């Protein structure tokens, strides 16, 4: 009960980071495409 809060937040942050990493990847692809 004392850990669930930071666990929820860590999971959330992990998803945010995964989404940002994919974005950068696509951006780099766009660059390599040009």
């Amino acid at each position: 009960a004392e850990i669930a809060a930071i666990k929820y937040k860590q999971a959330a942050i992990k998803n945010e980071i995964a989404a940002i990493k994919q974005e950068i990847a696509a951006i780099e692809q766009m660059i390599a495409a040009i």
């Binding site: 809060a5 930071i6 937040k9 942050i13 980071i17 940002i20 950068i24 951006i27 766009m30």
Partner: protein, 34 residues
């Protein structure tokens, strides 16, 4: 205390992520413009 330390770090991390979100958006705007 360790849980509190993690929670403090998550606040900072989330702050960085929101700033990164705007940076990514700015990058896409600029790439589209030029």
């Amino acid at each position: 205390e360790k849980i509190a330390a993690i929670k403090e770090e998550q606040a900072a991390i989330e702050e960085e992520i929101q700033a990164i979100k705007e940076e990514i958006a700015a990058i896409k705007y600029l790439i589209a413009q030029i």
